[PDB]
Design a protein around this ligand. Structure first.
Ligand code: MG
Ligand code: ZN
Ligand code: ZN
Ligand code: ZN
Lengths: 159, 141, 102, 114, 49, 196, 133, 84, 43, 559, 65, 263
RNA sequence: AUCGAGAGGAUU
């Protein structure tokens, strides 16, 4: 692996390093090893990273991956967007997935979680847990045809 | 008389088909630079020859002028649209009473037929005028 | 004001390096009028770059990652649209796991 | 079905002039005349014959859009020389070229066999 | 020119389309997955003509 | 469209005059663009045209048929003897002006299919027509003076713009809207509206 | 309203750089051995060749739409065979006690190098260029 | 409750979403023949009229910005900078 | 018309591929792009 | 998810679409027929009765006119029948539902929509021909050429529903897109393929053209630029007047490969004020690129000034081009004999090189590269050796191609095509593949039954040895048939897999919306980012700048 | 399909020339090449008006009433 | 004479291959355009149909007759039916034509344009004779018929122009080249080896001089001499085409002079 | 009218 790094004299130079590439994973027992840097070692599983270095690295990893999907293609999205996505999955404690098991069960109003996946049982148990719906989230006010609290609808106008 | 023989895929497994029935089995006793690069004879066990390679095509492709100078996709794409083309769809169109029907005022044989257009009866029921086309940057459209 | 100070940290390292005493004068011989403008300008032209309260930056960030995914069709690693699917399910059963030892 | 009948290419509709003439605001002594139900067949000729006159600074025509049968001519001229004259004395010059063409062709035509 | 091949069913031509099906009455060896207990299977769809 | 996936719609129509045109006096039937050549790599297209020229000329048939010993060399030496430059180019002249073309141009007899899909068979607009029975929403097809489905997938591009009042009106004033009566106690539509 | 430089140059290299209607020309001053000039020259309008010599001027004179000629009846600051009009962008230190001016005649370029020009070739919008013989 | 005349953070600028709507909101009022507050120097498009009413800070509305907790701020369409 | 009479269906490991053994029976090219692509075949 | 989230809706329309060079950017070619039906409800107001009243007489059938007239009583007048339909005395505070006319807010999208920018507002030009006509430039965001794709119009009904389109959605304000902090609409086709042509050093324009061109651009001050050439002739450079399209204060700097303040390549680019000083104009500059012009002229001068910038670069470029030409014969894809030799003699050594590896691997001398099969390292030895011939050969024919060569020339602009497009066409087509492996064994231990068993050379295994110009062989053909057949498989399903990805991605972020405290949250009011994008900045206004505190010697830093 | 008047491309009436083309081929036993040129068909646009022309009128007639 | 010099070299009843010395490119062109397009002619433009039992449909046949060439000699003293004060057509604006024809025999019965029949008063002007060049003497070929098939038509022929439809074009194919060797270098030849061994000398390289390797590029030179040839459908004969072209171009140039005078 | 299927377009 090529590596740019500072000469004492100032400039950045070409110091090429030997890096070891693997098939399969157990980070819990590879970083503990002699003669390898355990501040730098990288596994592309962001789920093992999460288990070992704990959530906040988890983020950074998952991101790197998500990015490296985009840039491999020669594409480029501005950090902020991916960041966001990543950050979203990251907040609720662990690794909230982008499917019904993950995000779409998390304490939101019923009319919203209605519009996504399990459209009936959401409504069912939400009539039995007697959920009170907030009505602050796009999907809720589409569903009753109101101007949804969005850009032009964020504030109220008075005279 | 036994000069041809029906062969199915299963059976196919045990044979050794030759492609050109000429060049591909006379003696091996100067070489026009334009003619594509044809492999060789490298086989001495031939049982069967192929009739004409041009026949791995079915109906739609067998309308394309030199598919062999083109890439997959397109060839496929044309097949999808040769079906959507338009003209002489039958001769009794006068006497039929079907919903929809589109016939070309002046349909032509193309100026560049396939050896299959022959038996596909294309020459006789074509769909397409043989229009003069320019392929240069003009006007702005 | 202790986020505000951080939330500008990067932009500044530039600003300070481009409006350096020897630079302003030596490299692009500015005057006093000009300079005061160069400031007057930045301050505003900056202030126009803040996000707007309103901006629905959910939907935005979804599409923004969505589109270029739709521009993926086809040295071994699960890459392209199949990897993206893996990542997003938080896939436990990943096709190409790998360490990269340093 | 949206299609506009061909004749809309040589016949003038309603309230429509052959020529509308307008002063340019950008330059001094410059004018932009519109020509309805015309085109290149005409424009191009007026413009290139109007570049023959030495007392003419600027001369240009455009067909702003193929769907319509317009075209605009903008002409700039020397101090004192009104643009209209520059058009007039340019237009005529054409006719007089064409007029002797007609005749010169005749004299030749008649001399041949077949 | 009309080549036939179709039927006519309430004044409308109908074609029957060639269906594809995995052959009957032949032996096939099928290496099974990792989390499955069986490692190989030999299959035979058996039918009488 | 042509015969090689090179599908396309008309764009404009230039009467025989303002069209370009060659020194022989020709007047192409249609023009396409070189752009359509390199990204899709269909070379048979220009080939058929080059080979076809020769057909039109010698008066014979184009042997386009696949695996054969035909070449662009072999066609070209035939167009050589036959009047033209071996590779399908003809010095053309602009229409508007008649100034010679800085460039030359590929130009040949090249078959071309007129496809189904007709323009004047889509052009549908709506201004409020009939409505379904169940929903009091609009009516699919074009064939019933239909509507156009405001995509759920397109609602997301409204949200995206922050345009909200446009998104209430698309969804209400038209599609639906309806005036119900609610009880302040039991939060439902038990209300009998004995109006007037 | 007046000349800004004048010198007699020796054409030392012609460069048909994948072109037909333009050349890049390598020429150096006679007398002053502290000088060279590289210039872009429409070799269809005025052919140059290796080991030729040409007189080279500047000026800034002989800003309202360029009136078409009509100038068999006007002053024309040219006994000159070939004349172009352009703009100057940067002015170059070759360390020293040396200088160089960079010129652009709508695409065609000119590099000139010396010293005494300090108080002549300005930082200016103006600048014609006149070759002859 | 409310929020005081001072102690206000909320971008004193105008967010497009505010402004876009301000225009719109008056550009309704206008096209329904309510009173005009400028001299209409040549235009008669009602939204082009509200753009000018804005250009001269004479639109008598007050943005009411909602912060997440439920508290909220007020800005006359005079106090707000309109850069963009 | 001719094209439709010579058509093949296939209900539902790598079916959609144009497989080595297809040479001579199925057309290497004719097949309806998209929807149910490569399942349907022309002889 | 079918009747609430997404309703079928009124006042809308769709046709085939077609690209109108002589239309401005923010515009929308809307066929009379269509604009003859859709209808905006307008109020009787002192400012309009003189227009409107005329419109109601002008009747529901000739253009600028109207159906339905609404009253105090809020009942309906049905202009297309009705006994008083050439009468009616518009009595203040009534609605007249007019036709849609020039210069209006229309929301023009496309399926499948995947940006804010799939959709946007245009200005209406009512036209001939039943089709929607839009400015080529606006062929990106929407995504779709002129091969048959339909598009959709939605005519708003509230005066704000207007504003909110023209202020927020309107087209030029989409030019530089949040997605990727660079513009998303940038000149293309001809335009670019000729803006290169126009700009060549060898392109000089004499007087007669220079005046039409000049005149052609609709913002031209009337001041003919002094011609670069004033000598034996008076000519300008192509650059010279293109420079009339570019505004004032615009500065642009590049440097490329050999770019040395003289560019003896005309390499790089330098734009000082409205004038271009040196360089050859193409993609990098005018493409929807980052460091390019559109990016610059927007942030500098206005979206507007930048919108009108498009159609000027156009109006001239297309014109110049019209009276120049450009094309592509198959002569664009021939190649010199003595190269046609060198390419075959490049291919033979590389076929005859796989023959020797294969020879070796068969006498058990092929060494097992750590961590792979003996076979696996042989597949890898081969693919790489033939993937390399084709590249060497393609680049051998990239060298052979002259300058006048329309292909080499579009690729020189970057209008359509890359390298590979050439490499194949003229010299060799390379290896085919399925599931990232060279051509499989369907027939027991062989590929086609025109072959021996257990033959591992390249001809046997899918190596199309011939160019497209030469023609493929029967085997070659079928192999390549097995290839492409894969591409067609993905774009059928690899699009629904995407189509679902997004649906979730969208439904998962949704209500994340920067609040008034600048802290980014959701419907619960739970923080996700305490400052959007870790710096509370909109993705739009940003651009890649060098922080040159970072590089350089500790030495060169002090200096 | 009754042989066109005038070419779509050139304009030279091609109406009259059809009958004449038939006889030239099978009467005096010519070749399509030279038998197209005997009738003043230089312009290949107009030349391929007659050659590609396919005359199905003959069949349409076969149907009885 | 003074200027715009014509000289024939070969001119038939349908071709007029001429040089054209001493002219502005512009006009030499704007002549062809106004020719191809703008020189009025009469052709069929309204077919009243009574009974037709052919195997071609109504609105085809009609389109046929459209093109069928009609004698347009004395045409410039025939009214435009959009002008003439009568309602629809009159023999002051139009030539009504008839065609009957019936399936008579066993052998296929043809329908030529020779089978067309004038019916309105010509007032003895030369108009509406369906032209024949056919050696056999049978105009065009309208249609074909088997045993029992009528056809009952009434074609009004009105004055029109190619700018309204290429039926009213009276011109077809107009050869037109300027400066054979690229003395002007208005072109840049595409090539592989010799640009001279690889493009063809045009018939018109005998009427200009070769350039001679030595001479440098003549710059201030412009476009004289234009090697034309006009072919004629024949409704108007050759000479008249060029003539009426020169004429009309001049007329529609004058309608301008006239238009300035009225302002 | 409504439910049910099949054919095709657009993402190259
Ligand atoms: Mg499309
Ligand atoms: Zn109640
Ligand atoms: Zn012709
Ligand atoms: Zn009359």
């Amino acid at each position: 692996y090529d590596r740019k790094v500072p000469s004492p004299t100032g400039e950045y130079v070409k110091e090429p390093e030997w890096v070891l590439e693997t098939d399969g994973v157990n980070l819990s027992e590879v970083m503990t090893v002699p003669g390898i840097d355990p501040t730098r070692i990288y596994t592309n599983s962001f789920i093992d990273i999460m288990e070992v270095l704990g959530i906040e690295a988890g983020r950074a990893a998952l991101y790197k991956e998500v990015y490296n999907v985009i840039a491999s293609d020669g594409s480029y999205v501005n950090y902020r967007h991916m960041a966001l996505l990543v950050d979203v999955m990251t907040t609720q404690g662990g690794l909230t997935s982008v499917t019904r098991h993950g995000f779409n069960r998390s304490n939101t109003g019923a009319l919203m979680r209605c519009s996504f996946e399990e459209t009936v049982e959401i409504l069912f148990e939400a009539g039995a847990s007697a959920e009170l719906d907030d009505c602050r989230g796009v999907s809720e006010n589409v569903i009753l045809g109101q101007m949804a609290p969005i850009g032009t609808g964020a504030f109220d106008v008075m005279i | 008389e036994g000069l041809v023989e029906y062969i199915d895929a299963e059976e196919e497994e045990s044979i050794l088909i030759a492609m050109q029935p000429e060049d591909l089995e006379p003696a091996e006793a100067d070489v026009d630079p334009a003619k594509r690069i044809r492999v060789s004879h490298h086989a001495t066990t031939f049982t069967h020859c192929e009739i004409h390679p041009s026949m791995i095509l079915g109906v739609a492709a067998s309308i394309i002028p030199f598919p062999d100078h083109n890439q997959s996709p397109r060839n496929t794409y044309q097949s999808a649209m040769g079906k959507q083309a338009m003209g002489v769809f039958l001769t009794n169109y006068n006497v039929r009473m079907d919903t929809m029907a589109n016939i070309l005022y002046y349909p032509q044989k193309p100026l560049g037929t396939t050896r299959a257009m022959e038996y596909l009866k294309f020459r006789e029921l074509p769909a397409g005028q043989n229009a003069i086309v320019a392929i240069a940057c003009y006007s702005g459209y | 004001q202790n986020a505000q100070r951080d939330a500008v940290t990067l932009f500044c390292c530039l600003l300070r390096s481009r409006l350096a005493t020897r630079r302003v004068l030596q490299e692009y011989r500015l005057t006093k009028q000009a300079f005061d403008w160069v400031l007057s300008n930045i301050e505003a032209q900056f202030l126009r770059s803040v996000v707007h309260p309103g901006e629905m930056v959910g939907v935005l960030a979804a599409q923004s990652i969505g589109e270029p995914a739709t521009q993926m069709t086809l040295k071994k690693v699960t890459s392209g649209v199949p990897r993206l699917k893996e990542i997003l399910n938080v896939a436990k059963n990943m096709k190409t796991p790998s360490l990269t030892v340093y | 079905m949206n299609a506009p009948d061909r004749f809309e290419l040589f016949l003038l509709g309603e309230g429509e002039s052959k020529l509308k003439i307008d002063p340019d605001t950008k330059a001094p002594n410059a004018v932009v005349i519109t020509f309805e139900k015309e085109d290149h067949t005409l424009g191009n000729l007026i413009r290139a014959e109007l570049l023959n006159d030495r007392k003419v600074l600027f001369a240009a025509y455009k067909v702003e859009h193929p769907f319509f049968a317009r075209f605009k001519l903008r002409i700039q001229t020397t101090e004192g020389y009104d643009p209209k004259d520059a058009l007039k004395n340019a237009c005529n010059s054409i006719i007089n070229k064409l007029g002797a063409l007609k005749t010169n062709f005749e004299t030749e035509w008649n001399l041949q066999t077949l | 020119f009309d080549m036939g091949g179709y039927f006519i069913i309430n004044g409308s031509e109908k074609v029957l389309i060639a269906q594809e099906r995995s052959a009957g009455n032949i032996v096939q060896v099928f290496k099974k997955a990792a989390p499955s207990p069986i490692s190989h299977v030999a299959e035979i769809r058996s039918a009488l003509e | 469209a042509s015969r090689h996936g090179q599908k396309g719609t008309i764009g404009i129509t230039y009467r025989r005059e303002d069209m370009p045109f060659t020194a022989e006096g020709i007047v192409p039937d249609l023009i396409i663009n070189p752009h359509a050549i390199p990204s899709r790599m269909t070379v048979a297209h220009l080939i058929e045209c080059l080979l076809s020229k020769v057909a039109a000329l010698s008066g014979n048939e184009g042997d386009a048929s696949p695996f054969t010993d035909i070449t662009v060399e072999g066609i070209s030496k035939l167009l050589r003897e036959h009047g033209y430059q071996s590779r399908g180019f003809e010095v053309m002249y602009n229409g508007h002006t008649g100034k010679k073309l800085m460039a030359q141009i590929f130009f040949g007899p090249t078959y071309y299919q007129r496809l189904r899909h007709m323009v004047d068979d889509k052009i549908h607009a709506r201004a409020r027509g009939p409505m379904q029975v169940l929903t009091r929403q609009p009516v699919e097809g074009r064939s019933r003076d239909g509507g156009l489905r405001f995509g759920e997938m397109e609602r997301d591009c409204m949200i995206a713009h922050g345009a909200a009042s446009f998104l209430k009106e698309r969804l209400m004033e038209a599609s639906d809207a309806f005036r119900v009566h609610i009880c302040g106690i039991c939060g439902l539509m038990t209300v009998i509206a004995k109006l007037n | 309203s007046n000349t800004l430089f004048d010198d007699i140059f020796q054409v030392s290299e012609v460069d048909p750089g994948r072109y037909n209607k333009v050349c890049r020309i390598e020429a150096a001053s006679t007398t002053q051995d502290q000088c060279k000039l590289t210039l872009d020259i429409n070799v269809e309008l005025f052919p140059v060749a290796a080991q030729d010599s040409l007189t080279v001027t500047i000026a800034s004179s002989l800003t309202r739409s360029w009136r078409p000629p009509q100038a068999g009846d006007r002053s024309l600051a040219d006994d000159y065979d070939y004349v172009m009009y352009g703009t100057a962008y940067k002015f170059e230190e070759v360390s020293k006690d040396l200088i160089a001016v960079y010129y652009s005649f709508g695409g065609l370029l000119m590099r000139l190098e010396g010293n005494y020009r300090n108080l002549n070739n300005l930082k200016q919008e103006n600048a014609y260029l006149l070759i002859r013989r | 409750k409310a929020i005081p005349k001072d102690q206000r953070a909320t971008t004193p600028y105008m967010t497009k979403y505010e402004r876009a709507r301000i225009l719109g909101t008056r550009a309704l009022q206008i096209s329904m023949n309510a009173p005009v507050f400028v001299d209409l120097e040549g235009e008669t498009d009602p939204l082009r009229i509200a753009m000018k009413e804005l250009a001269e800070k004479k639109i008598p509305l007050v943005i009411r910005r909602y912060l997440p907790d439920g508290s909220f701020e007020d800005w006359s369409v005079e106090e707000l900078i309109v850069d963009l | 018309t001719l094209s439709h009479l010579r058509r093949t269906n296939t209900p539902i490991a790598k079916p959609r591929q144009l497989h080595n053994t297809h040479w001579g029976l199925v057309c290497p090219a004719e097949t309806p792009e998209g929807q149910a692509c490569g399942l349907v075949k022309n002889l | 998810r079918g009747n609430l989230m997404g309703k079928r809706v009124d006042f809308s329309a769709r046709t085939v679409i077609s690209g109108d060079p002589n239309l401005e950017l923010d515009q929308v070619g809307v066929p009379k027929s269509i604009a003859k039906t859709l209808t905006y409800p307008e109020v009787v107001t002192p400012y309009n009765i003189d227009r409107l009243t005329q419109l109601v007489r002008n009747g529901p059938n000739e253009h600028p006119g109207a159906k339905y007239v609404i009253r105090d009583s809020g009942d309906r007048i049905d202009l297309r029948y009705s006994k008083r339909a050439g009468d009616i005395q518009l009595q203040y505070g009534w609605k007249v539902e007019r036709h849609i006319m020039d210069n209006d807010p229309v929301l023009f999208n496309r399926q499948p929509s995947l940006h804010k920018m799939s959709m946007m507002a245009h200005r209406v030009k009512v036209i001939p021909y039943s089709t929607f006509r839009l400015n080529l430039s606006v062929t990106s965001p929407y995504n779709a050429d002129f091969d048959g794709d339909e598009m959709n119009l939605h005519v708003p009904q509230s005066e704000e529903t207007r504003a909110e389109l023209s202020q927020l959605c309107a087209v030029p304000l989409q030019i530089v897109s949040p997605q990727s902090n660079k513009p998303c609409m940038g000149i293309v086709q001809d335009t670019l393929c000729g803006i290169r042509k126009l700009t060549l050093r060898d392109t000089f324009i004499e007087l007669d053209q220079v005046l039409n061109m000049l005149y052609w651009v609709p913002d031209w001050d009337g001041v003919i630029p002094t011609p670069a050439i004033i000598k034996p002739k008076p000519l300008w450079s192509g650059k010279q007047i293109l420079s009339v399209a570019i505004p004032n204060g615009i500065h642009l700097q590049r440097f490329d490969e050999g770019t040395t303040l003289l560019s003896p390549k005309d390499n790089g680019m330098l734009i000082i004020d409205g004038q271009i000083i040196f360089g050859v104009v193409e993609k990098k500059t005018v493409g929807s690129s980052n460091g390019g012009l559109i990016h610059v002229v927007t942030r500098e001068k206005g979206p507007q000034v930048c919108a009108k910038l498009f159609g000027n670069i156009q109006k001239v470029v297309n014109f110049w081009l019209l009276h120049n030409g450009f094309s592509t014969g198959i002569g664009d894809t021939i190649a010199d004999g003595p190269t046609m030799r060198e390419i075959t003699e490049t291919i033979a050594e590389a076929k005859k090189k796989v023959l020797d590896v294969t020879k070796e691997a068969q006498a058990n001398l092929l060494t097992a590269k750590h961590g792979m099969t003996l076979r696996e390292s042989f597949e890898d030895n081969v693919v790489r050796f033939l993937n390399e011939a084709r590249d060497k050969a393609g680049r051998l024919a990239e060298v052979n191609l002259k300058d006048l060569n329309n292909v080499k020339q579009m690729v020189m602009a970057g209008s359509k095509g890359s390298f590979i497009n050439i490499a194949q066409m003229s010299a060799c087509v390379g290896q085919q593949s399925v599931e990232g492996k060279r051509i499989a064994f369907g027939f027991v231990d062989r590929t086609l039954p025109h072959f021996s068993k257990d033959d591992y050379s390249p001809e046997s295994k899918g190596f199309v040895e011939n160019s497209y110009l030469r023609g493929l062989t029967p085997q070659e053909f079928f192999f390549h048939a097995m290839g492409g057949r894969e591409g067609l498989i993905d774009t059928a399903v690899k699009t629904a897999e995407t189509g679902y990805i997004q649906r979730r991605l969208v439904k998962a972020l949704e209500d994340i919306m920067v609040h008034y405290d600048n802290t980014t949250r959701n419907s619960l009011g739970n923080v996700i980012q305490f400052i959007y994008g870790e710096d509370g900045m909109d993705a739009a206004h940003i651009e890649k700048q060098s922080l040159d505190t970072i590089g350089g010697s500790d030495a060169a830093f002090e200096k | 399909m009754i042989v066109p008047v005038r070419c779509f491309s050139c304009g030279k009436v091609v109406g009259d020339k059809w009958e004449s083309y038939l006889n030239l081929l099978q009467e005096d036993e010519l070749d399509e090449g030279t038998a197209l040129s005997r009738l003043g068909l230089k312009r290949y646009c107009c030349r391929r008006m007659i050659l590609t022309h396919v005359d199905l009128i003959e069949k349409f007639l076969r149907y009885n009433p | 004479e003074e200027g715009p010099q014509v000289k024939i070299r070969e001119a038939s009843k349908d071709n007029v291959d001429f040089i054209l010395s001493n002219v502005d490119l512009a006009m030499a062109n704007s002549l062809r355009r106004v020719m191809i397009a703008e020189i009025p002619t009469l052709a069929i433009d309204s077919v009243e149909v009574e009974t037709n039992t052919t195997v071609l449909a109504d609105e085809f046949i009609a389109h046929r007759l459209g093109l069928i060439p009609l004698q347009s000699m004395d045409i410039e003293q025939l009214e435009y039916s959009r002008d003439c004060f009568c309602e629809d057509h009159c023999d002051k604006c139009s030539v009504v034509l008839t065609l009957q024809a019936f399936g008579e025999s066993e052998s296929t019965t043809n329908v030529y344009s020779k089978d067309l029949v004038i019916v309105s008063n010509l007032m003895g002007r030369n108009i509406g004779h369906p032209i024949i060049q056919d050696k056999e003497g049978n105009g065009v070929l309208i249609c074909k018929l088997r045993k029992g098939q009528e056809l009952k038509l009434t074609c009004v022929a009105k004055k029109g122009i190619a700018k309204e439809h290429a039926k009213w074009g009276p011109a077809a194919a107009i050869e037109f080249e300027y400066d054979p060797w690229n003395k002007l270098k208005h072109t840049d030849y595409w090539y592989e080896q010799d640009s001279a061994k690889e493009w063809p000398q045009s018939k018109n390289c005998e009427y200009e001089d070769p350039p001679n390797e030595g001479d440098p590029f003549d710059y201030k030179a412009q476009a004289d001499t234009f090697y034309m040839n006009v072919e004629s459908v024949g409704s108007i004969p050759v000479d008249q085409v060029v003539v009426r072209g020169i004429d009309t171009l001049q007329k529609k140039v004058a309608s301008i002079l006239l238009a300035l005078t009225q302002m």
